[PDB]
mmCIF file of N, CA and C in Angstrom:
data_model
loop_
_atom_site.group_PDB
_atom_site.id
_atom_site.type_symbol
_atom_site.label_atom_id
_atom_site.label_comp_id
_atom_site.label_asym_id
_atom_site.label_seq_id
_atom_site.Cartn_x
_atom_site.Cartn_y
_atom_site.Cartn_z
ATOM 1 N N UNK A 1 -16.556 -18.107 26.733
ATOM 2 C CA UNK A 1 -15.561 -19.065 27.201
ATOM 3 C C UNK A 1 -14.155 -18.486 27.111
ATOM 4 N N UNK A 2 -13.768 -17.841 26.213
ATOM 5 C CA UNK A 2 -12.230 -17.638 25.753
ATOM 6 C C UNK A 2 -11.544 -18.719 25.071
ATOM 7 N N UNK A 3 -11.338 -19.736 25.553
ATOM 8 C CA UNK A 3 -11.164 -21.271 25.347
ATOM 9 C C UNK A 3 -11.043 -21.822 23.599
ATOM 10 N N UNK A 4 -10.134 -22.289 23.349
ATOM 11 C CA UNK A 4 -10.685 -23.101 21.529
ATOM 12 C C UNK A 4 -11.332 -24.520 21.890
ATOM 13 N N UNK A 5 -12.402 -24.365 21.123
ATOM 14 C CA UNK A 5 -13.137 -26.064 21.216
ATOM 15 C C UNK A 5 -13.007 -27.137 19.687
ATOM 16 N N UNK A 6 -12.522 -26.032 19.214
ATOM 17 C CA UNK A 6 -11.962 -26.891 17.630
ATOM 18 C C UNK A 6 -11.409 -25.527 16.760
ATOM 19 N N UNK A 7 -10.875 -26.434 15.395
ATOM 20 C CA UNK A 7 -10.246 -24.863 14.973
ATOM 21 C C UNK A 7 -10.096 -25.949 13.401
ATOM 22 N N UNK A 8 -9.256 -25.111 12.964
ATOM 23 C CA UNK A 8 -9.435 -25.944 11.249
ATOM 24 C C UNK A 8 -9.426 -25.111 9.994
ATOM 25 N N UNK A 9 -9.465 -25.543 8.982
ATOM 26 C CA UNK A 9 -9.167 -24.640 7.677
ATOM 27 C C UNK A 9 -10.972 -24.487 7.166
ATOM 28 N N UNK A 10 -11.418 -23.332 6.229
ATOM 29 C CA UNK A 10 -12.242 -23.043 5.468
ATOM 30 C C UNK A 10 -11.741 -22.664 4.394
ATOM 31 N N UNK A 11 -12.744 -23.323 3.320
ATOM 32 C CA UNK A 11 -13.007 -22.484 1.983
ATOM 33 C C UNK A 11 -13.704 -21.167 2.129
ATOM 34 N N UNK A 12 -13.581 -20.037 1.523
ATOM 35 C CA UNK A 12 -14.412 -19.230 1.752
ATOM 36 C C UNK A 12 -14.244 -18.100 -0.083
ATOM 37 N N UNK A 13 -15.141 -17.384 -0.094
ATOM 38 C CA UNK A 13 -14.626 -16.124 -1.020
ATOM 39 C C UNK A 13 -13.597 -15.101 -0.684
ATOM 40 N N UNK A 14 -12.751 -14.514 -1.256
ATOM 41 C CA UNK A 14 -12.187 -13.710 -0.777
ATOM 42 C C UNK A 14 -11.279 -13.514 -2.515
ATOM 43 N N UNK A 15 -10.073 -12.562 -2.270
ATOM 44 C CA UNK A 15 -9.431 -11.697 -3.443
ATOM 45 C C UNK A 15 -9.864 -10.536 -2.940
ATOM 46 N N UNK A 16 -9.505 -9.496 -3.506
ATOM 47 C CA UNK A 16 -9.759 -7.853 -3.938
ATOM 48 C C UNK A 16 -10.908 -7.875 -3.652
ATOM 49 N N UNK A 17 -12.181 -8.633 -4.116
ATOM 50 C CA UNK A 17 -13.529 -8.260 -4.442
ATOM 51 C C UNK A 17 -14.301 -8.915 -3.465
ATOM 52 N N UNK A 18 -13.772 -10.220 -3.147
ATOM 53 C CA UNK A 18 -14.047 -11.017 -2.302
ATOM 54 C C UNK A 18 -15.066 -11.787 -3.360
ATOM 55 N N UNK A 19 -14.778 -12.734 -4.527
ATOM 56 C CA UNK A 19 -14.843 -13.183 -5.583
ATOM 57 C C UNK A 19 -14.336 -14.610 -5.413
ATOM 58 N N UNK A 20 -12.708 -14.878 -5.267
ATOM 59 C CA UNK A 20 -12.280 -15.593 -5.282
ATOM 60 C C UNK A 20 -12.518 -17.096 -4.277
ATOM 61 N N UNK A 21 -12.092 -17.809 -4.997
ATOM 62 C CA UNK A 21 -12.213 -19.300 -3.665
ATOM 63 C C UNK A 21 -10.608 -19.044 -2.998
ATOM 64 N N UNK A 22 -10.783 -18.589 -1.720
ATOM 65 C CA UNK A 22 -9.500 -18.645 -0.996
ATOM 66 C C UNK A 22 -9.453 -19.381 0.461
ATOM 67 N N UNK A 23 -8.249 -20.108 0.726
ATOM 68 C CA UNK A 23 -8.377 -20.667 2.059
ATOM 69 C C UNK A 23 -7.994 -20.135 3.266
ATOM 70 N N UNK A 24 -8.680 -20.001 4.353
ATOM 71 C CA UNK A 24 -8.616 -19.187 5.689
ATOM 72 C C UNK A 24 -8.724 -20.651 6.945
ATOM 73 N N UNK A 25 -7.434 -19.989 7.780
ATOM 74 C CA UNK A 25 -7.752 -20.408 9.304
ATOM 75 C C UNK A 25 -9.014 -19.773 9.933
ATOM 76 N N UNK A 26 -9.711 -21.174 10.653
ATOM 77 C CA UNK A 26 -11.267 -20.781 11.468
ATOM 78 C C UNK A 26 -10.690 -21.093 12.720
ATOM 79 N N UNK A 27 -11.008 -20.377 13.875
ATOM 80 C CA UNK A 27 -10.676 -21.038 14.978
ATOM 81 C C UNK A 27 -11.943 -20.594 16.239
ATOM 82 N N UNK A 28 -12.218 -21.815 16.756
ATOM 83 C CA UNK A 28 -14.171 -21.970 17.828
ATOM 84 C C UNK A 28 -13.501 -21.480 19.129
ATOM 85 N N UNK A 29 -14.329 -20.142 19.523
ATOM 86 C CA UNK A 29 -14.071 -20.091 21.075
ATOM 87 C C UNK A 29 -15.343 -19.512 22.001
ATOM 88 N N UNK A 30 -16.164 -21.142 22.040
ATOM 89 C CA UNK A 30 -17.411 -21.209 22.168
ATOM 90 C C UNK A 30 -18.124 -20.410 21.495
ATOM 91 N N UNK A 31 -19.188 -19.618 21.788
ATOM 92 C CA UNK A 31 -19.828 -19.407 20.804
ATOM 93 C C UNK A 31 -19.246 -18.182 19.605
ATOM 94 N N UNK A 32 -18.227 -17.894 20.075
ATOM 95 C CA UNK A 32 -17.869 -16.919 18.928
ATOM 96 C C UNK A 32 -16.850 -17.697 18.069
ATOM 97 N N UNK A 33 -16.677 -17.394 16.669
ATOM 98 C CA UNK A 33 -15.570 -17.778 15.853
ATOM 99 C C UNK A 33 -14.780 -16.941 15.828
ATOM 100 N N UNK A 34 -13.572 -17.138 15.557
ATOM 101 C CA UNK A 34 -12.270 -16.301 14.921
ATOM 102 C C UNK A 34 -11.739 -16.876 13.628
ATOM 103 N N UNK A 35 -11.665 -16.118 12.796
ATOM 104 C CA UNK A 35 -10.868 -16.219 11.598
ATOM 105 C C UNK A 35 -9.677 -15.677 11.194
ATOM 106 N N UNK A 36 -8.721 -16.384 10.561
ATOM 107 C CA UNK A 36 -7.290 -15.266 10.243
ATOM 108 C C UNK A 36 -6.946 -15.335 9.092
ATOM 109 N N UNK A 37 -5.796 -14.548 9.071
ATOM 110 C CA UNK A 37 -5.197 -13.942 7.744
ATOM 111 C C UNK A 37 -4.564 -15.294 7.667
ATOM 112 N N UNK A 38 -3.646 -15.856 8.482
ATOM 113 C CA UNK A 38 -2.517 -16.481 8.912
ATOM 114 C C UNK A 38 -2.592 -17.248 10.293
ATOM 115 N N UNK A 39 -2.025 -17.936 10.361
ATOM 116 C CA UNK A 39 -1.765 -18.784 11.655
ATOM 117 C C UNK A 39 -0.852 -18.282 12.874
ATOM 118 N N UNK A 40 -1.356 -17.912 13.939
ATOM 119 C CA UNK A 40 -1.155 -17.153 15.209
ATOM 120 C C UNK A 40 0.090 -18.039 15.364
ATOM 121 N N UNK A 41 0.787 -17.198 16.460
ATOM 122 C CA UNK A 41 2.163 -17.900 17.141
ATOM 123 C C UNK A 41 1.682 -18.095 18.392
ATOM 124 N N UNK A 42 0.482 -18.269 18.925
ATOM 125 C CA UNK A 42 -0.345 -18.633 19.788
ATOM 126 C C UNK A 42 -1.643 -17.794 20.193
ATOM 127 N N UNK A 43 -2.229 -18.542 21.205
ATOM 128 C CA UNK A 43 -3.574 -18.193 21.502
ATOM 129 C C UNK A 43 -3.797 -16.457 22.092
ATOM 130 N N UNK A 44 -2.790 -16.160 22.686
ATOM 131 C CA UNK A 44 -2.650 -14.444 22.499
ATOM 132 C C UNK A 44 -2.604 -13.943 21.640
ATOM 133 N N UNK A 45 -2.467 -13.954 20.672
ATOM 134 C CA UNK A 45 -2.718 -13.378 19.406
ATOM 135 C C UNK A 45 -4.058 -13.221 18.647
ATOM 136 N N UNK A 46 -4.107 -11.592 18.185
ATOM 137 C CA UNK A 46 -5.384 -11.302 18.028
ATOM 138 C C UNK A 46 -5.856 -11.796 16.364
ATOM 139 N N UNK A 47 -6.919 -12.136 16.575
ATOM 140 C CA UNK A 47 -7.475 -12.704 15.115
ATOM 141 C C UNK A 47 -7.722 -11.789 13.772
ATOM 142 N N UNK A 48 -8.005 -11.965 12.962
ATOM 143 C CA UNK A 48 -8.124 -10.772 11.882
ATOM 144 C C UNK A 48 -9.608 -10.381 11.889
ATOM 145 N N UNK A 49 -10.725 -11.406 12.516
ATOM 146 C CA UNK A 49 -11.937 -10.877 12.679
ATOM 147 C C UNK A 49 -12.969 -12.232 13.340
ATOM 148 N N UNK A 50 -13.948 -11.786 13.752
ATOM 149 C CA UNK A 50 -14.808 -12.913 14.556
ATOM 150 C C UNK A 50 -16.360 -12.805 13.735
ATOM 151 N N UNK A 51 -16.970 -13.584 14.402
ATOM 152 C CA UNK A 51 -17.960 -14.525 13.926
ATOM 153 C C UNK A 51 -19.021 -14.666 15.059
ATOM 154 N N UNK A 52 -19.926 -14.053 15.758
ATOM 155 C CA UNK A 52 -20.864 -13.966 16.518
ATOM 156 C C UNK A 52 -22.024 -15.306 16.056
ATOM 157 N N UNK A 53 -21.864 -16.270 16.055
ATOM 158 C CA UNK A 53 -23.093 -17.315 16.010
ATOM 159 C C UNK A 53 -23.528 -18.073 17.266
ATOM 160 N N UNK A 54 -23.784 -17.314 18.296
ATOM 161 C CA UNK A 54 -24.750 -17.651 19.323
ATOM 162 C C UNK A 54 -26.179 -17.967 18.644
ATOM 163 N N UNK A 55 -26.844 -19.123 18.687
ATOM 164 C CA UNK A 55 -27.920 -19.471 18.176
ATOM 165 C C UNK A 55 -27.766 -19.137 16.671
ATOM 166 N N UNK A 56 -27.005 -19.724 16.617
ATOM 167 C CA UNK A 56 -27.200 -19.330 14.856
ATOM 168 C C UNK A 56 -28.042 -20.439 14.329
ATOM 169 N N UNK A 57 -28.521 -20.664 12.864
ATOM 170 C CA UNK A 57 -28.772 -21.373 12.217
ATOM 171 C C UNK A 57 -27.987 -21.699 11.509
ATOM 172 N N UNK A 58 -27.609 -23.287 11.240
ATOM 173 C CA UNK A 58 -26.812 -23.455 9.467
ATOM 174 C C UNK A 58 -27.710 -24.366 8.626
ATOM 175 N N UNK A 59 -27.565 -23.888 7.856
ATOM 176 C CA UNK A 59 -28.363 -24.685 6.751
ATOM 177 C C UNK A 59 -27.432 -25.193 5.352
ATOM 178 N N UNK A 60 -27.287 -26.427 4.848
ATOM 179 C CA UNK A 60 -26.537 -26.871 3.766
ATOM 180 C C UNK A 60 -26.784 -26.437 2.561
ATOM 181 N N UNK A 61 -26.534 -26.203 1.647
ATOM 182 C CA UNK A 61 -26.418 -25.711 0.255
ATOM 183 C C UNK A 61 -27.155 -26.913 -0.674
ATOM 184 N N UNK A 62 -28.239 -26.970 -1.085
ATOM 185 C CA UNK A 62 -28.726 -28.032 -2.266
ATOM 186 C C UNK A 62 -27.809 -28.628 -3.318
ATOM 187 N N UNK A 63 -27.060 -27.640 -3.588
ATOM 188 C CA UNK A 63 -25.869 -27.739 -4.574
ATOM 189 C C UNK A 63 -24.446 -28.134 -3.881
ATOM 190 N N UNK A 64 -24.488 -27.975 -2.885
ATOM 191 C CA UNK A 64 -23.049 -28.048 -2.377
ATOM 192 C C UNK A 64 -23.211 -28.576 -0.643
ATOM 193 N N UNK A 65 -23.704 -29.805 -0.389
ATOM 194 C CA UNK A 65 -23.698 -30.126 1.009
ATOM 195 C C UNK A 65 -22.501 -29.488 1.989
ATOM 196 N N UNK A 66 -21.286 -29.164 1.473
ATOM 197 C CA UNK A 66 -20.082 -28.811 2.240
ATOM 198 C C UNK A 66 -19.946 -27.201 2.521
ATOM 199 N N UNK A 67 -20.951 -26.401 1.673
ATOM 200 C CA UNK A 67 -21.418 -25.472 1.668
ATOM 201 C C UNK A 67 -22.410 -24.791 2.812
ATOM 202 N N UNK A 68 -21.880 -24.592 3.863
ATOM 203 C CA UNK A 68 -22.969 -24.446 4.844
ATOM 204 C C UNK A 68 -23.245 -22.515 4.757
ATOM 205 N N UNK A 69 -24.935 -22.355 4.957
ATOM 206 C CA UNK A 69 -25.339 -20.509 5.142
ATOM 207 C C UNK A 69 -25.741 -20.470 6.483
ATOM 208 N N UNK A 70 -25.020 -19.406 6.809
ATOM 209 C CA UNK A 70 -24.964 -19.178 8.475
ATOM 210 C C UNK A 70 -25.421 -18.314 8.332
ATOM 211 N N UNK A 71 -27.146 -18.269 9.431
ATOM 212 C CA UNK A 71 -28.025 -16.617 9.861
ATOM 213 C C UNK A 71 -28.191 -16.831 11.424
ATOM 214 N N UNK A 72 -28.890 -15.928 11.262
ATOM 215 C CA UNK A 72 -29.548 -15.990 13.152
ATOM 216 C C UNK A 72 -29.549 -14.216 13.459
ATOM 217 N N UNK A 73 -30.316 -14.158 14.526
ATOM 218 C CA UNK A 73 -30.624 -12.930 14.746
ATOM 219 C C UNK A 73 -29.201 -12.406 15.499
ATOM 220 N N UNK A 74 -28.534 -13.122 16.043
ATOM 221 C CA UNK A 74 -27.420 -12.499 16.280
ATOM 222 C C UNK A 74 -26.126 -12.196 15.722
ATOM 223 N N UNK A 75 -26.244 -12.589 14.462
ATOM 224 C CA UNK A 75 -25.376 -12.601 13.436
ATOM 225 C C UNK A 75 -25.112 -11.097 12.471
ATOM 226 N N UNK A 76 -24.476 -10.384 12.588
ATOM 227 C CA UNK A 76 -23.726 -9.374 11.767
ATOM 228 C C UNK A 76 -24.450 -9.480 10.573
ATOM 229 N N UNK A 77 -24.079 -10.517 9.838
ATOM 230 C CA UNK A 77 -24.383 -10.822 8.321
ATOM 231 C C UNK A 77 -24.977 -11.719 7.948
ATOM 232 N N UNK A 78 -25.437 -12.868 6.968
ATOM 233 C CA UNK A 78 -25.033 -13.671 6.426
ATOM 234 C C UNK A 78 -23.955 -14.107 5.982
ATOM 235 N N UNK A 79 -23.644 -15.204 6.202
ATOM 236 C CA UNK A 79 -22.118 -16.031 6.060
ATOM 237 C C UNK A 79 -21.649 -17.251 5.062
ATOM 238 N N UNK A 80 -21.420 -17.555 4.890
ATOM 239 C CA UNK A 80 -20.945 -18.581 3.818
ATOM 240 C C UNK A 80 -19.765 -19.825 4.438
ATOM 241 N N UNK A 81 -19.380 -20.676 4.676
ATOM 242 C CA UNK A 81 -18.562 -21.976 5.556
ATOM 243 C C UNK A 81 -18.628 -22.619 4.417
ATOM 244 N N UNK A 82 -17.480 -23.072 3.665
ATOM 245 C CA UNK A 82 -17.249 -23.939 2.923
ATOM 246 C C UNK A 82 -16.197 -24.885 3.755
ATOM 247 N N UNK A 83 -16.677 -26.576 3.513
ATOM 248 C CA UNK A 83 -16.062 -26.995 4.321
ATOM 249 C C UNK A 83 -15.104 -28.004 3.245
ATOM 250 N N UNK A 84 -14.041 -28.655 3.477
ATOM 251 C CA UNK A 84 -13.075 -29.322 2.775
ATOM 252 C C UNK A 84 -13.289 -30.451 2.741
ATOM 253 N N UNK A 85 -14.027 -31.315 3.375
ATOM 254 C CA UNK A 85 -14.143 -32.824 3.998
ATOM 255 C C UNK A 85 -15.582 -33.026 4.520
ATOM 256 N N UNK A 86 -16.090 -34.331 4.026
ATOM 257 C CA UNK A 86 -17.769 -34.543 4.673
ATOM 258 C C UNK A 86 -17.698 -34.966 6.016
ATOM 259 N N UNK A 87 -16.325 -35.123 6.729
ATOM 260 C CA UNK A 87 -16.085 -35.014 8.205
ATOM 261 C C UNK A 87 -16.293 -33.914 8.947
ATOM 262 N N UNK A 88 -15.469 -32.745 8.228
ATOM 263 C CA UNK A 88 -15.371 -31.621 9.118
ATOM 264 C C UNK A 88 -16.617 -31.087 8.422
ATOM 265 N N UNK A 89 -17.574 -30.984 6.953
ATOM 266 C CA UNK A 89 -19.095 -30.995 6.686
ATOM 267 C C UNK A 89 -19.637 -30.847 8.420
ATOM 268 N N UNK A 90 -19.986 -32.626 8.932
ATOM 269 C CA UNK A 90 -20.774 -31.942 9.816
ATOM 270 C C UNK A 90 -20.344 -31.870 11.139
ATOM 271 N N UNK A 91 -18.935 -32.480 11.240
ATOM 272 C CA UNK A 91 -18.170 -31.666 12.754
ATOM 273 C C UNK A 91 -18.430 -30.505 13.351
ATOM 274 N N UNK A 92 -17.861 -29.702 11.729
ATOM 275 C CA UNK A 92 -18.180 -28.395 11.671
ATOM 276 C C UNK A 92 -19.212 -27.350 12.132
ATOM 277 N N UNK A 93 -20.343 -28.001 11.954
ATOM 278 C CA UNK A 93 -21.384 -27.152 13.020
ATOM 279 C C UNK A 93 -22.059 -27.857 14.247
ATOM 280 N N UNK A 94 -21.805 -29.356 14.402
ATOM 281 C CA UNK A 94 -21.719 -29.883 15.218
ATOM 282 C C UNK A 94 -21.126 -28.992 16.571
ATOM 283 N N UNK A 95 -19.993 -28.760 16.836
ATOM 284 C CA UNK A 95 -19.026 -28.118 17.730
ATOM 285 C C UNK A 95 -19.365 -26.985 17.526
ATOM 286 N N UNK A 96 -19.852 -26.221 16.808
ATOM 287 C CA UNK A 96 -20.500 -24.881 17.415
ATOM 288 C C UNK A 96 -21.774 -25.290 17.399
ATOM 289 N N UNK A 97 -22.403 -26.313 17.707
ATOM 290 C CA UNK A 97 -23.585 -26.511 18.580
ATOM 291 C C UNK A 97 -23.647 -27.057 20.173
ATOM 292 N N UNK A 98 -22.189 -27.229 20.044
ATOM 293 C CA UNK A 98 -21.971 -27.973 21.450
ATOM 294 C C UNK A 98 -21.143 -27.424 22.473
ATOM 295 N N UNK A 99 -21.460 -25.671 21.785
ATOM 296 C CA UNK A 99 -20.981 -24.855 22.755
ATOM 297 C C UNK A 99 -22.090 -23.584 23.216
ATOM 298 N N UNK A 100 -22.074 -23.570 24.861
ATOM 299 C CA UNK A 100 -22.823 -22.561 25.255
ATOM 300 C C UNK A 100 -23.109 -21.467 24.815
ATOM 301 N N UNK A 101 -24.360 -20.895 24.863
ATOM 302 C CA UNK A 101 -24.153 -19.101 24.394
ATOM 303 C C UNK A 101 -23.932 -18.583 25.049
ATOM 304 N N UNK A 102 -23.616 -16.912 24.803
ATOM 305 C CA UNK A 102 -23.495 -16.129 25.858
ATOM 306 C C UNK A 102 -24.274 -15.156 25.987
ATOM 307 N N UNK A 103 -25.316 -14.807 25.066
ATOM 308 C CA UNK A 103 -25.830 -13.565 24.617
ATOM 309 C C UNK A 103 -27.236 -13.801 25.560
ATOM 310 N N UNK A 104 -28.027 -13.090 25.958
ATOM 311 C CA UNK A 104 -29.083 -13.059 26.846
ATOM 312 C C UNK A 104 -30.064 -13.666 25.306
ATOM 313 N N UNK A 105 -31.034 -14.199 25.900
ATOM 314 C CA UNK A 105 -32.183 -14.690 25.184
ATOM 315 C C UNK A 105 -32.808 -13.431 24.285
ATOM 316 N N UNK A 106 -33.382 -13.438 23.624
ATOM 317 C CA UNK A 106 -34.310 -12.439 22.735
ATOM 318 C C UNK A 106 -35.896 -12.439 22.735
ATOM 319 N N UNK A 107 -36.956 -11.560 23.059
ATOM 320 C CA UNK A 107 -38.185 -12.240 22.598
ATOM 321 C C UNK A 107 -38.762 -11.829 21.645
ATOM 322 N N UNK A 108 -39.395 -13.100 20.867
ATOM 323 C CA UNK A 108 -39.459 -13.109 19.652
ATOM 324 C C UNK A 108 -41.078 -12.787 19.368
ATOM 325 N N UNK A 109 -41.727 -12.424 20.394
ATOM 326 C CA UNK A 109 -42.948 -12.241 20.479
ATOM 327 C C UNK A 109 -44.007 -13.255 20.160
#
C-alpha cells in the first residue's frame, strides 16, 4: 500500500541490551509495520526499521493479555507488541488484519 492505516505508541524491550521496558512509535502501512526512534516530521521520512507481518500470527501472552508474540513464516524474527490500553490490546492486531498482503502465497505442502 505505502499508505498509514493506524499508527500509535508500543511498549517494547530495548536499552543497550535490549533489556529494558522502553517506549517506541509503531506506524501500519498495510501489511508492513514501521517503527521509530522518534516521531517523523512527516510521512517522507524514513523509519528506523520495519516489520514484515503479511500473514502473521499473534497470539496473547497468558501472563500479560496486552502482550501480544508475533510469528509467521514471513516474519524475520519473532516479535514481542506490548500494548498500553485493552483498546489498542485488540485494535492493535485487528488493523493489521484488515490489511491486504502483498507477498505471493507459500505452499505449505
Amino acid at each position: 500500500m505505502g499508505s498509514v492505516e493506524y499508527s500509535g505508541y508500543l511498549q517494547k524491550t530495548g536499552g543497550k541490551f535490549y533489556k529494558k521496558n522502553q517506549t517506541r512509535y509503531f506506524e501500519l502501512r498495510g501489511p508492513m509495520l514501521c517503527y521509530w526512534k522518534r516521531r517523523p516530521s512527516g510521512p517522507h521520512v524514513s523509519p528506523t526499521g520495519t516489520i514484515d507481518l503479511t500473514n502473521a500470527r499473534f497470539v496473547e501472552n497468558p501472563k500479560d493479555p496486552r502482550s501480544w508474540t508475533i510469528e509467521g513464516d514471513h516474519l524475520s524474527k519473532t516479535f514481542t507488541l506490548t500494548a498500553d490500553t485493552e483498546e489498542q490490546r485488540e485494535a492493535w492486531v485487528r488493523e493489521m488484519s484488515k490489511v491486504k498482503p502483498e507477498n505471493r502465497e507459500q505452499l505449505e505442502h
